[PDB]
Amino acid sequence: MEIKLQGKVSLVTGSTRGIGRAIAEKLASAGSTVIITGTSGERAKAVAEEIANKYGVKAHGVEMNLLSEESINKAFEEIYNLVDGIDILVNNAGITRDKLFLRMSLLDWEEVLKVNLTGTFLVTQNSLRKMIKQRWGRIVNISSVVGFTGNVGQVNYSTTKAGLIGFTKSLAKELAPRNVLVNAVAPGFIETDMTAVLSEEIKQKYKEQIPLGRFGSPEEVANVVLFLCSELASYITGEVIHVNGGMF
Amino acid sequence: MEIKLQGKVSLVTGSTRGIGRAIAEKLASAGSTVIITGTSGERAKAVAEEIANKYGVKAHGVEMNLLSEESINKAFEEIYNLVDGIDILVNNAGITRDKLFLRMSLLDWEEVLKVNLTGTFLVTQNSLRKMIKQRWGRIVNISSVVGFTGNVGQVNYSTTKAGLIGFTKSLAKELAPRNVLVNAVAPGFIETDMTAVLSEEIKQKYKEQIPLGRFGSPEEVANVVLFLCSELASYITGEVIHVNGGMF
Amino acid sequence: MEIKLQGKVSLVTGSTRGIGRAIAEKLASAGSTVIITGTSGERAKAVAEEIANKYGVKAHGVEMNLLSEESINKAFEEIYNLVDGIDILVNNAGITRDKLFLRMSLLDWEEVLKVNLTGTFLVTQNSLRKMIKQRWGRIVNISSVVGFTGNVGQVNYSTTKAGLIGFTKSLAKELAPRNVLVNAVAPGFIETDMTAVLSEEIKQKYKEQIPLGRFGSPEEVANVVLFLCSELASYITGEVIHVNGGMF
Amino acid sequence: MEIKLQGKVSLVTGSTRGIGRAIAEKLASAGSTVIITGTSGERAKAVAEEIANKYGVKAHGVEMNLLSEESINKAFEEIYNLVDGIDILVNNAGITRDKLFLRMSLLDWEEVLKVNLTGTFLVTQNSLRKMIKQRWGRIVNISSVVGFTGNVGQVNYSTTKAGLIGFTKSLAKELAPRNVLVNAVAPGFIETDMTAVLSEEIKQKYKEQIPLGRFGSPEEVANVVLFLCSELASYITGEVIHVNGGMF
C-alpha cells in the first residue's frame, strides 16, 4: 500500500521553511511536482532547488507576498507558465502579530486577516482551474489548535484560524459536486527552529499541556497533509484533522 | 426572578432594524439605556426616539459605518459625550455579499471581512474602558449557524461568522481576569423583513432543516442576548449559544 | 422582565444536595412546584420540606435509586398520585467511580453507565406524558466539561457525560414537533461540599485551568437551568450550554 | 512512501461483514496479521480463511458476542494463544435497536449500550497489554455522524456513538504517556449490502444530505482507519476523523 503522487502538481504556500517546507518535502517524497513560495523569490527558488536535488522531483520556486494581491496574481502567472495547472493546494502561509487586545494596532489586526484569510482566499481562487476541470483536487488549509481554544495575545490570529474552518466547510460544500475536497489540518505545538528562542521553562510549561508530553515535528504535520492528498482520504471533505498530541 | 438592567448602558450595532433592533428593544425593556447605530445617523436617532417613547428609557442614535474607521471614531466621540461609558456591547452589525466562490470578487470578500471582523474589532476596542475599570462587562457577538455548518454561496460570510468564534474565545480568555464576559449567539434561520423577499417556496425548504418546524423570531434571539447580559450568565464566558430550533 | 414558573411542576433528580439542590431551589424561587429525589426517601422529603418552608412552594420528596428500575417505577407511581404531571425535568442525578482505565473494574464501569445513562433514560421516558399532551415541556440534562475534554481517571464518567450530548441532540429532534425542548448544561469546576475534601493545593491547581480564576457556585449552574426552563429559551433545543468560566 | 504493517497484529471486532470486514481486509492488504470476530465463530474463521487466501497474511477468526462478558474474555483467551499480543485494535462492532424514544423498550436501550460502550470497554481493556509494554499501540473506535447530529429513532445508538467520543478523549489522555494513540473515525452514510433494502426514494433523500452526492464505500472508511494505524498519524490522539462526504 503506497501513496504516490507522481504526475500531480502541489502548491504549498510559505514553504521556504518550517512546517510549510516539511509539507513540500513530504509531498515531493511521495512523487509530487512541487511549487515553493516565499516572500523572497530567491529563497523560494533556492529551496525548490534543494528539494529537487534531494528527491529528484520537478520543483519551482516563486516569490509570493500574501499581503499583496498583485504579488499573488503575479506569482500565479509564473506558475501557470511552468505547469499545466495545480492538483493540490496547501494553504500554509500564515502570520501572527501578537498583542494584548486592548492595545492591538489596526495594522496588527488587518495584516493577520489579510494574509491568513484574504491571501488564502486569493491563492485558492487562483488554484482551482485544473481541479474543477478534471474533477479531482485537494485543498488543505493549515489552521491551528488556537482557532479552537482561543489564546491570550492572539485574538487576531485565533479569529483567522477559526475563520479558516468556516472557509473550509463552505468551500467543501460548493466544490463537492466536482470532487474537489477541501479540508483543514489544525496543528497543536510543533517544534520548528523558531522554538529555539523559547526558555526551557516556558517550553516545559507548554509541554505540560500535551498528553503525549512532546512537541510534534513538522514532518508529523506534513504526514497528515499527505494523507489528505492521498487516495485514502477520498471520502473526507469539510473536515478538520487536529494534530496536537491529545491537547484538544 | 427579575432581569433588570437599569443603570447599565448597552451599545447594539446595526440596530435600526431586524435582529439588531429587537435586541436593543429587549435590553431597553429590561431597563437598559441603549445606543442604536446605523449607516444612517438620521435613521438611528429616529429609532432611538421610538424605542425611548415605547419603553421610557434613555436612548441615543449615532451614525456608524463599520467599513470606515473614521466613522467609528466619530461615533465613539459622540457616545462618550453622551454616556459615562458602555457596560454592554452587542456586536450585531454585519453584511453578506453572497456569491458562489468561483464568482466571488475580491471586494465581495474584503468588504464582508472588513465590516464583520474588522468593524467588530474596532467597536469592541472602543467599548471596553468602563467594563475593565469596574470589573463588570458583557460583550455578545452575533455569529450564525452557517459559521458552523458552512453554506453554499456564503464562503465569505461563513468565514466571518466562524472567525467571530475564535475572536470570542480568545477575547474571553484575555478579559476573564477582569470579569468581562465575552460570548456569542449563533442564530439559525430567523424571520425578519428581509425574509419576505424569499418564496413561500424557498422558505418551506429552509424550514425542512428545522426540527421545531418554524423560523425563530428576532425577539427569540434577543431573549438569549438578554440572558447573556443578566446575572444568570455570570459563570459563562468564551461560549457560543446556538439558537436555531435544533438544526445544529 | 420576570421569569416565573408558577403553575409548573419540575422534577430534579438527585437534588437532596449539591448542584441538584441548588437547581431545585432556583426553580422554586421562580415559583415552580418541585419534586426532590434522592437515594434516601426520608432525606428527599426532608429537603422538600425545607425548600417548601423557605420559598413557600408546593414541594414533594421521593426516593429514587437510578440503578433500580423498580425504585424508579415506584417513585413515578407516587409522583403521579401527587401531581397532575411534569412540565420540567432536570436530569441531574449521576455518580462517579474514578479509576485509571487499567485499574477499572466492570462494575466501576457498568454502574456509572447504568445510573448516568440508563437511569436518565428511564426517568425521561416516565416524565414526558404531560409535556407531549400540552405541547410544552423542558428537559435539561446535566453533562460536564469532561464529557468534552475527556479526563484522566474518568473514562467511565466522561463516556456518560459525552453520551448525554448524543441523547440530548437525538431526543431534541424527536420531540421538537411537540415543542418539548431538550438541552444540556455542561458545568466546569463547581464548588460544592464535596470540594472541601480536596487540598487547597489541588483546588488552586484546578483553578489554573479557569480563565475567570474561580470555581463556579451551584447557584450559577442553577441559573442556567432556570434560563433553559424560561420563555427566553423558546428557540433553543438540542443545544449544550457550557458553564465553566471560560475553560472550554 | 508506503504504509506497511508487517509484523503487527490487528484485532477488528465485528469484521465478518460490512465495514468491519473492509477494515480487516485493508489492514491485511498493508501486511498486518488480522483477527476477525463475529457472533458466529464459524463465520469468523471462514472470513479469516478467505482473507488469508486473498492477501497471504496470518489471520484468525474467533467467536465474540459483545453482549456477553464471558464470550469476550473467552475470545481473548483464544487470541492470546495464537498471537504474542495485539498492536492495533479497531472497535468496530456495534448494533442498533431503533425505536422512537417514548416507546423504546429497556432491553432495546440496554443492549445498544452493552455492546457499543461496555463491549468496547472490555475489548479495549483486554487488548492493551502488548501496546503498553512496547510503548506503541493504536486503538480506533468506530463512532458515527449520528453521535454528533443526533437522529430520530436512534436516541440509544446516538447516545453510544457520542459516548465513544468521551471514551476516546479520556483514554487518549491516560495512554498518551505510553505512546498508545486512541482515536475515533465517524463515518457518515456508507454503502454496505444492507443498503440494498432501502427504497430508491429513501436513498436519494439520504444522498441529498451529502455534498459529494454519493454514499461512501466501506473501503473509504477502512482507508481512514489504516491511516490512523500508520506512521503518518503518530502525532494524532484523542481526535475524531469524520468520513462523511461533507455532511457534517
Tab-separated table of C-alpha atoms in Angstrom, chain A:
chain	number	residue	atom	x	y	z
A	1	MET	CA	0.000	0.000	0.000
A	2	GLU	CA	1.869	3.085	-1.093
A	3	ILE	CA	0.855	6.692	-1.547
A	4	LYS	CA	2.103	8.080	-4.768
A	5	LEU	CA	1.596	11.490	-6.282
A	6	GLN	CA	3.715	11.224	-9.442
A	7	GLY	CA	2.087	13.272	-12.154
A	8	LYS	CA	0.394	15.649	-9.692
A	9	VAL	CA	1.419	19.239	-9.016
A	10	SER	CA	1.248	20.613	-5.468
A	11	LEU	CA	1.489	24.288	-4.487
A	12	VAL	CA	2.476	24.872	-0.854
A	13	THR	CA	2.425	28.487	0.261
A	14	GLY	CA	5.005	29.754	2.742
A	15	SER	CA	7.175	26.702	2.191
A	16	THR	CA	10.742	28.083	2.385
A	17	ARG	CA	10.959	26.931	5.966
A	18	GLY	CA	9.264	25.317	8.906
A	19	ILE	CA	6.047	23.401	8.565
A	20	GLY	CA	5.483	24.612	5.001
A	21	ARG	CA	8.881	23.327	3.908
A	22	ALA	CA	8.242	19.961	5.644
A	23	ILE	CA	4.949	19.710	3.811
A	24	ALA	CA	6.523	20.397	0.403
A	25	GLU	CA	9.290	17.878	1.125
A	26	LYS	CA	6.770	15.287	2.194
A	27	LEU	CA	4.705	15.722	-0.989
A	28	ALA	CA	7.921	15.607	-3.062
A	29	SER	CA	8.893	12.400	-1.243
A	30	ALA	CA	5.631	10.867	-2.487
A	31	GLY	CA	6.458	11.913	-6.077
A	32	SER	CA	4.648	15.184	-6.460
A	33	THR	CA	5.914	18.092	-8.535
A	34	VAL	CA	6.101	20.966	-6.035
A	35	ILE	CA	5.801	24.709	-6.086
A	36	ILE	CA	7.546	26.528	-3.265
A	37	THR	CA	6.584	30.096	-2.348
A	38	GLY	CA	8.123	32.632	-0.014
A	39	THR	CA	8.275	36.410	0.406
A	40	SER	CA	11.732	36.117	-1.131
A	41	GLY	CA	11.754	34.730	-4.674
A	42	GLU	CA	15.435	33.925	-4.287
A	43	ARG	CA	14.979	31.844	-1.187
A	44	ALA	CA	11.983	30.091	-2.757
A	45	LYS	CA	13.996	29.118	-5.816
A	46	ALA	CA	16.880	28.011	-3.609
A	47	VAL	CA	14.637	25.774	-1.531
A	48	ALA	CA	12.972	24.384	-4.612
A	49	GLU	CA	16.423	23.546	-5.987
A	50	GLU	CA	17.400	21.761	-2.783
A	51	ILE	CA	14.193	19.749	-2.730
A	52	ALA	CA	14.614	18.775	-6.397
A	53	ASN	CA	18.164	17.593	-5.684
A	54	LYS	CA	17.155	15.627	-2.596
A	55	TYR	CA	14.089	13.879	-4.049
A	56	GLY	CA	14.626	14.215	-7.785
A	57	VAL	CA	11.269	15.913	-8.439
A	58	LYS	CA	10.357	18.835	-10.692
A	59	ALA	CA	10.230	21.807	-8.288
A	60	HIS	CA	9.723	25.545	-8.861
A	61	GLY	CA	10.063	28.480	-6.516
A	62	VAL	CA	8.129	31.748	-6.859
A	63	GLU	CA	8.016	34.882	-4.817
A	64	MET	CA	4.604	35.459	-3.265
A	65	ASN	CA	3.800	38.021	-0.646
A	66	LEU	CA	0.276	37.301	0.575
A	67	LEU	CA	-0.010	40.869	1.814
A	68	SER	CA	-0.194	41.889	-1.835
A	69	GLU	CA	-2.922	40.878	-4.232
A	70	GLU	CA	-0.613	41.972	-7.034
A	71	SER	CA	2.206	39.708	-5.807
A	72	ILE	CA	-0.195	36.755	-5.649
A	73	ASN	CA	-1.714	37.100	-9.144
A	74	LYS	CA	1.804	37.708	-10.475
A	75	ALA	CA	3.155	34.559	-8.835
A	76	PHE	CA	0.331	32.667	-10.480
A	77	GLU	CA	1.199	33.993	-13.916
A	78	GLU	CA	4.663	32.487	-13.420
A	79	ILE	CA	3.203	29.267	-12.060
A	80	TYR	CA	0.875	28.677	-14.982
A	81	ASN	CA	3.743	29.095	-17.413
A	82	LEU	CA	5.621	26.293	-15.612
A	83	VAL	CA	2.891	23.694	-15.042
A	84	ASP	CA	-0.337	22.668	-16.743
A	85	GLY	CA	-2.119	23.524	-13.524
A	86	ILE	CA	-2.469	22.728	-9.811
A	87	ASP	CA	-3.929	19.478	-8.472
A	88	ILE	CA	-3.129	20.019	-4.794
A	89	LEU	CA	-3.072	23.261	-2.839
A	90	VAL	CA	-1.818	23.537	0.735
A	91	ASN	CA	-2.687	26.971	2.198
A	92	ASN	CA	0.066	27.039	4.810
A	93	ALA	CA	1.260	30.643	4.694
A	94	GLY	CA	0.130	32.499	7.793
A	95	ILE	CA	1.489	35.134	10.151
A	96	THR	CA	0.999	36.278	13.744
A	97	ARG	CA	1.182	39.876	15.042
A	98	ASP	CA	0.777	39.245	18.773
A	99	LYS	CA	-0.532	41.904	21.153
A	100	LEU	CA	-2.991	42.071	24.024
A	101	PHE	CA	-6.303	43.101	22.535
A	102	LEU	CA	-6.904	46.408	24.187
A	103	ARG	CA	-3.722	47.585	22.589
A	104	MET	CA	-3.561	45.841	19.288
A	105	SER	CA	-2.964	48.256	16.432
A	106	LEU	CA	-5.321	48.242	13.452
A	107	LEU	CA	-2.373	47.308	11.272
A	108	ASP	CA	-1.539	44.297	13.509
A	109	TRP	CA	-5.147	43.129	13.184
A	110	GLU	CA	-5.541	43.757	9.471
A	111	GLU	CA	-2.261	42.260	8.300
A	112	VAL	CA	-3.116	38.993	10.042
A	113	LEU	CA	-6.521	38.934	8.379
A	114	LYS	CA	-5.021	39.996	5.017
A	115	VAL	CA	-2.529	37.176	4.877
A	116	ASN	CA	-4.365	34.360	6.672
A	117	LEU	CA	-7.874	34.818	5.266
A	118	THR	CA	-7.632	37.059	2.175
A	119	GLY	CA	-4.361	35.549	0.959
A	120	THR	CA	-5.834	32.077	1.370
A	121	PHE	CA	-8.981	33.227	-0.486
A	122	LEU	CA	-6.957	34.570	-3.459
A	123	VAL	CA	-4.489	31.709	-3.642
A	124	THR	CA	-7.317	29.198	-3.540
A	125	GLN	CA	-9.362	31.012	-6.223
A	126	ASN	CA	-6.278	31.040	-8.491
A	127	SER	CA	-5.558	27.323	-7.973
A	128	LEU	CA	-8.944	25.803	-8.820
A	129	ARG	CA	-8.952	25.669	-12.627
A	130	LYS	CA	-7.343	22.271	-13.296
A	131	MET	CA	-9.062	20.683	-10.297
A	132	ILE	CA	-12.584	21.579	-11.353
A	133	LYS	CA	-11.886	20.651	-14.962
A	134	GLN	CA	-10.626	17.141	-14.136
A	135	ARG	CA	-12.963	16.605	-11.177
A	136	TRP	CA	-10.137	15.831	-8.802
A	137	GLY	CA	-8.482	18.274	-6.474
A	138	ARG	CA	-7.332	18.560	-2.875
A	139	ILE	CA	-7.116	21.809	-0.876
A	140	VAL	CA	-5.714	21.646	2.629
A	141	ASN	CA	-5.886	24.703	4.859
A	142	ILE	CA	-3.481	24.884	7.765
A	143	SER	CA	-5.427	26.168	10.791
A	144	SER	CA	-4.313	25.876	14.480
A	145	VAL	CA	-5.451	24.500	17.776
A	146	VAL	CA	-5.618	28.186	18.819
A	147	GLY	CA	-8.516	28.818	16.398
A	148	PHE	CA	-10.489	26.371	18.556
A	149	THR	CA	-9.372	27.163	22.072
A	150	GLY	CA	-8.595	30.860	21.678
A	151	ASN	CA	-5.260	32.236	23.051
A	152	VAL	CA	-4.266	35.305	25.063
A	153	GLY	CA	-2.430	37.872	22.921
A	154	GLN	CA	-3.644	36.282	19.684
A	155	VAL	CA	-7.209	37.457	19.232
A	156	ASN	CA	-6.309	38.346	15.552
A	157	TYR	CA	-4.568	35.041	14.832
A	158	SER	CA	-7.277	32.968	16.568
A	159	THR	CA	-10.004	34.831	14.654
A	160	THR	CA	-8.319	33.837	11.373
A	161	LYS	CA	-7.597	30.236	12.313
A	162	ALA	CA	-11.261	29.751	13.355
A	163	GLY	CA	-12.350	31.664	10.225
A	164	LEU	CA	-10.491	29.147	8.079
A	165	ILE	CA	-12.747	26.421	9.408
A	166	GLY	CA	-15.870	28.260	8.113
A	167	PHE	CA	-13.954	28.798	4.879
A	168	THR	CA	-13.143	25.081	4.693
A	169	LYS	CA	-16.670	23.832	5.375
A	170	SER	CA	-18.373	26.288	2.995
A	171	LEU	CA	-15.937	25.756	0.171
A	172	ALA	CA	-16.079	21.986	0.665
A	173	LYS	CA	-19.840	22.122	0.121
A	174	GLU	CA	-19.550	24.197	-3.058
A	175	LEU	CA	-16.839	22.095	-4.609
A	176	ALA	CA	-18.045	18.659	-3.529
A	177	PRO	CA	-20.111	18.147	-6.745
A	178	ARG	CA	-16.808	18.464	-8.652
A	179	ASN	CA	-14.949	16.005	-6.417
A	180	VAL	CA	-12.526	18.688	-5.181
A	181	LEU	CA	-12.079	18.016	-1.439
A	182	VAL	CA	-11.401	20.854	0.975
A	183	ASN	CA	-10.127	20.099	4.446
A	184	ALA	CA	-8.115	21.645	7.273
A	185	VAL	CA	-5.319	20.386	9.488
A	186	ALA	CA	-5.051	22.040	12.948
A	187	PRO	CA	-1.611	21.518	14.425
A	188	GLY	CA	-1.002	21.960	18.114
A	189	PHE	CA	2.507	22.816	19.432
A	190	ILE	CA	5.057	21.928	16.758
A	191	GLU	CA	8.818	22.223	17.063
A	192	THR	CA	10.447	24.415	14.397
A	193	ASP	CA	13.837	26.181	14.578
A	194	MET	CA	11.946	29.179	15.941
A	195	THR	CA	11.078	27.142	19.022
A	196	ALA	CA	14.758	27.680	19.845
A	197	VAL	CA	14.122	31.186	21.243
A	198	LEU	CA	11.820	29.914	23.995
A	199	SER	CA	13.175	29.453	27.536
A	200	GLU	CA	13.379	25.856	28.790
A	201	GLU	CA	10.910	26.924	31.411
A	202	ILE	CA	8.226	28.194	29.023
A	203	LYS	CA	8.667	25.071	26.865
A	204	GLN	CA	8.089	22.675	29.749
A	205	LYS	CA	5.040	24.730	30.601
A	206	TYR	CA	3.698	24.198	27.062
A	207	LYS	CA	4.582	20.503	27.055
A	208	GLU	CA	2.596	20.078	30.247
A	209	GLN	CA	-0.500	20.895	28.191
A	210	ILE	CA	0.322	17.957	25.876
A	211	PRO	CA	-0.681	14.392	26.809
A	212	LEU	CA	1.999	12.836	24.582
A	213	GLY	CA	4.486	15.032	26.534
A	214	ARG	CA	6.351	16.254	23.496
A	215	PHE	CA	6.027	18.793	20.689
A	216	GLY	CA	5.195	17.324	17.309
A	217	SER	CA	7.660	17.553	14.451
A	218	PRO	CA	6.960	19.461	11.213
A	219	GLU	CA	7.104	16.092	9.454
A	220	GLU	CA	4.282	14.713	11.654
A	221	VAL	CA	2.130	17.625	10.430
A	222	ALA	CA	3.257	17.081	6.836
A	223	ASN	CA	2.252	13.420	7.105
A	224	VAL	CA	-1.342	14.342	7.828
A	225	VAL	CA	-1.388	16.770	4.890
A	226	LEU	CA	-0.027	13.943	2.717
A	227	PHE	CA	-2.850	11.683	3.925
A	228	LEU	CA	-5.454	14.271	2.905
A	229	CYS	CA	-3.885	14.479	-0.586
A	230	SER	CA	-3.905	10.695	-0.933
A	231	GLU	CA	-6.409	8.157	-2.162
A	232	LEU	CA	-7.001	7.202	1.456
A	233	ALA	CA	-8.978	10.439	2.102
A	234	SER	CA	-11.342	10.232	-0.888
A	235	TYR	CA	-14.487	10.398	1.291
A	236	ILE	CA	-13.321	13.199	3.570
A	237	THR	CA	-14.290	16.804	2.853
A	238	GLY	CA	-15.262	19.772	5.007
A	239	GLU	CA	-13.326	18.227	7.913
A	240	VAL	CA	-10.606	19.445	10.284
A	241	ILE	CA	-7.974	16.970	11.486
A	242	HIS	CA	-6.332	18.033	14.749
A	243	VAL	CA	-2.683	17.041	15.077
A	244	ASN	CA	-1.828	18.130	18.573
A	245	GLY	CA	-0.744	15.195	20.677
A	246	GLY	CA	-4.002	14.984	22.599
A	247	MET	CA	-4.198	18.614	23.665
A	248	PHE	CA	-7.648	19.247	22.223
